[PDB]
Amino acid sequence: KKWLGTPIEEMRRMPRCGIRLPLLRPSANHTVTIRVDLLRAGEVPKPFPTHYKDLWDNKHVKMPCSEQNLYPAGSRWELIQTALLNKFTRPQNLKDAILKYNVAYSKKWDFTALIDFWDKVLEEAEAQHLYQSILPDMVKIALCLPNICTQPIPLLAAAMNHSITMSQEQIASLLANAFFCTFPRRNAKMKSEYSSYPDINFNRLFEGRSSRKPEKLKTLFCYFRRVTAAAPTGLVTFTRQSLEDFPEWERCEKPLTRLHVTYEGTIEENGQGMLQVDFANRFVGGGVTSAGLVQEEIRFLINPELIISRLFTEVLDHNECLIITGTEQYSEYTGYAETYRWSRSHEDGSERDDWQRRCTEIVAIDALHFRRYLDQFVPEKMRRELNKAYCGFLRPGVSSENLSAVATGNWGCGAFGGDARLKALIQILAAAAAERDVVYFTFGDSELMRDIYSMHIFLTERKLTVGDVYKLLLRYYNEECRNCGPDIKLYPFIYHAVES
Numbered sequence: 001k002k003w004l005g006t007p008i009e010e011m012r013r014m015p016r017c018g019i020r021l022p023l024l025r026p027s028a029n030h031t032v033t034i035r036v037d038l039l040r041a042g043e044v045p046k047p048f049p050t051h052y053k054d055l056w057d058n059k060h061v062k063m064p065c066s067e068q069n070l071y072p073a074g075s076r077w078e079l080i081q082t083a084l085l086n087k088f089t090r091p092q093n094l095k096d097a098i099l100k101y102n103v104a105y106s107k108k109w110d111f112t113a114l115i116d117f118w119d120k121v122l123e124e125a126e127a128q129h130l131y132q133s134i135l136p137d138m139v140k141i142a143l144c145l146p147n148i149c150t151q152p153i154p155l156l157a158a159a160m161n162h163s164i165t166m167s168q169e170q171i172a173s174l175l176a177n178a179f180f181c182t183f184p185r186r187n188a189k190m191k192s193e194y195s196s197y198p199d200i201n202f203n204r205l206f207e208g209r210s211s212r213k214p215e216k217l218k219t220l221f222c223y224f225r226r227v228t229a230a231a232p233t234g235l236v237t238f239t240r241q242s243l244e245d246f247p248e249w250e251r252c253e254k255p256l257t258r259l260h261v262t263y264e265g266t267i268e269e270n271g272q273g274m275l276q277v278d279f280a281n282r283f284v285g286g287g288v289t290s291a292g293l294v295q296e297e298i299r300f301l302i303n304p305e306l307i308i309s310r311l312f313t314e315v316l317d318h319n320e321c322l323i324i325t326g327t328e329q330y331s332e333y334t335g336y337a338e339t340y341r342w343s344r345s346h347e348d349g350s351e352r353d354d355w356q357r358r359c360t361e362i363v364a365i366d367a368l369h370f371r372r373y374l375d376q377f378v379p380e381k382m383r384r385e386l387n388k389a390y391c392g393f394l395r396p397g398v399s400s401e402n403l404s405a406v407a408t409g410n411w412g413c414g415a416f417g418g419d420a421r422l423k424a425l426i427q428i429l430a431a432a433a434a435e436r437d438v439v440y441f442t443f444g445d446s447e448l449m450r451d452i453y454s455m456h457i458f459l460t461e462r463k464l465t466v467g468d469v470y471k472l473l474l475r476y477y478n479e480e481c482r483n484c485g486p487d488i489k490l491y492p493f494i495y496h497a498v499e500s
């Protein structure tokens with residue numbers, strides 16, 4: 001009674017189900033920032049090219065170490081170096097350092113949470129370790145950026161189908177810069193450039209008095225402590241995927257696939273090696289660098305390499321997703337939102353693939369935010385969610401036998417107002433169209449587990465196709481929502497319509 005349906009042991013997982021990876025190589029649609037010819041297990045990857053190369057334009061990340069990063073003109077990189085190469089002994093020292101190259105935000109950025117964490121949460125020995133060891137080591141890896149990220153990083157802009165593969169070490173240098181708020185043109189509230197990109201600098205983690213900010217900082221300093229002490233050796237791939245041809249859902253003759261549904265476990269622990277869904281905001285990462293702390297933000301905190309997607313990933317349009325392969329888990333946690341707490345450091349035991357990427361694949365798909373509950377049953381909105389999930393699950397050019405199951409849950413069903421029973425069925429239909437099985441976590445809701453299982457077995461036993469089910473959703477809208485909360489609920493309607 002803890003789980004229902006297909007045993008999870010029968011679901012496909014990476015690496016066992018994967019196909020031989022092609023040779024890792026840069027191309028028109030794949031940026032590779034390391035020496036592939038020297039990539040070896042257990043060895044820190046060598047950056048390619050050897051000497052720093054800069055691009056300062058509207059198609060690439062504006063690096064803080066660029067000679068074009070100026071301030072009315074002096075070199076901002078020189079200023080960052082002078083500011084950060086000072087001894088920190090009190091939190092005000094770190095605030096003052098960050099503001100030396102952010103003078104325009106000195107009356108706008110609040111540092112209360114950073115001050116409280118250092119002075120009021122940490123004990124004396126933990127504070128001493130922070131400013132004697134961790135922060136100086138973070139400064140050093142940040143300032144090493146021009147020797148580490150030698151190759152320009154393209155923006156993954158809207159409508160681009162493009163991948164970036166970089167080393168975990170390169171990500172660590174970039175995230176250290178984000179912590180010290182060094183990325184230029186990413187700060188103004190009323191900016192034109194980068195207005196369609198998420199925040200990357202960490203200044204909003206330092207503001208306010210929530211009991212959540214200290215837990216976020218503990219989680220991030222756990223990561224920073226680990227990666228400055230011993231450089232991680234693997235790679236991470238970021239792929240923006242934007243599809244043009246979407247199924248004619250009413251006409252899809254594909255059958256449903258297999259389902260495992262359970263009210264215990266988590267996507268990240270029990271969906272190891274599966275395609276793990278991030279319940280994303282259209283600005284990937286949501287409020288990770290500010291106040292948010294539900295499913296997406298938590299994943300971005302315990303696997304912080306996800307955070308760097310915000311440096312270069314434009315806001316997702318309706319037909320797009322972001323696929324990240326290779327991020328490592330550095331922390332364990334309990335709770336969520338107001339009960340979230342950092343638990344301990346985590347030693348990731350995931351195998352690495354032939355590109356030295358952890359066998360962990362996460363897809364960010366953003367559900368819609370519904371102001372009115374009945375809005376989500378409008379056909380245009382159901383099709384939208386179907387196509388979003390389909391884009392996140394589809395892998396053009398891969399046999400279904402080589403596709404892991406999808407590990408997911410009540411996507412968009414918290415603050416975004418989604419109906420769990422509808423969103424479960426939508427994901428089941430999208431997974432079926434993408435020829436993937438579904439592993440579904442209901443997060444303690446045993447009744448929902450039973451309901452999803454019952455509907456899935458009902459539909460499969462009667463051999464209903466994807467299109468058969470979609471037309472029942474359309475019928476539900478017309479008969480119970482269009483001219484209407486509804487008088488009859490969705491699953492009861494479906495049972496009655498089919499049994500009729």
Ligand SMILES: Cn1c(=O)c2[nH]c(SCCN3CCS(=O)(=O)CC3)nc2n(C)c1=O
Nearest residue numbers: 266267294295336408409410413414441443
């Ligand atoms: C399947 N699944 C979750 O659903 C989940 N939620 C959170 S934190 C936000 C709480 N909330 C969001 C949607 S909900 O309201 O439907 C139920 C719970 N962490 C989660 N993990 C690790 C997970 O595996």
